[PDB]
Design a protein around this nucleic acid. Structure first.
Ligand SMILES: [Zn+2]
Ligand SMILES: [Zn+2]
Ligand SMILES: [Zn+2]
Ligand SMILES: [Zn+2]
Lengths: 78, 87
DNA sequence: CAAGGGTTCAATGCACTTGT
DNA sequence: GACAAGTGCATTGAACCCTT
């Protein structure tokens, strides 16, 4: 029923602390697992929504963080 | 006045004219792959999705229908020229 | 059963190379 | 060159599996 608090796509439930879609769950997981750092090619305030969330990996990751997603909830690879 | 060149299919930023239509790299590749595989898709909604950056990954049938409606030419994908007898 | 951890891999789309 | 057609491959995310 819920919406992803990051992007407004349909949430599949809570993940890493926040209501989120499989997209944002997957993306946060990969980011934390590989310990990736992104750079924004604009002004660090890009639109992240269901339509254009893939245009800025920095801004998407920052928005996962501001929405409440916890790096510590991402487990080690199995 | 033209602030962004727009993909006629989905409204993302267009990279150029591909198979005779102003389109983004996503729609270009989707169209090429659809055509080279002769894919037949089946919309699991109402056969009438409006295409945008979200609905382009959700409905292949309606995306391909839009590609064609905007003038993408499937006969121009890997036609039988000398270059193909190559590969 | 449900939730929220996990994983998978076909499709995707960005960056590239090739041909004119 | 600059463009458009073709290619390589890392990333995306819907659909699974696993343990509580
Ligand atoms: Zn999301
Ligand atoms: Zn950004
Ligand atoms: Zn497009
Ligand atoms: Zn459709």
């Amino acid at each position: 029923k819920h919406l992803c608090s990051i992007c407004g796509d349909r949430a599949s439930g809570k993940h890493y602390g926040v209501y989120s879609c499989e997209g944002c769950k997957g993306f946060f997981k990969r980011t934390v697992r590989k310990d990736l750092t992104y750079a924004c090619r604009e002004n660090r305030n890009c639109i992240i929504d269901k339509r254009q969330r893939n245009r800025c990996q920095y801004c998407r990751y920052q928005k996962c963080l501001t929405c409440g997603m916890k790096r510590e909830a991402v487990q080690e690879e199995r | 006045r033209v602030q962004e060149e727009l993909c006629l299919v989905c409204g993302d930023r267009a990279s150029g004219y591909h198979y005779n239509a102003l389109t983004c790299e996503g729609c270009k590749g989707f169209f090429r792959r659809s055509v080279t595989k002769s894919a037949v898709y089946c919309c699991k909604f109402g056969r009438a999705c409006e295409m945008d950056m979200y609905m382009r990954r959700k409905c292949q049938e309606c995306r391909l229908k839009k590609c064609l409606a905007v003038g993408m030419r499937p006969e121009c994908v890997v036609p039988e020229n000398q270059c193909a007898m190559k590969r």
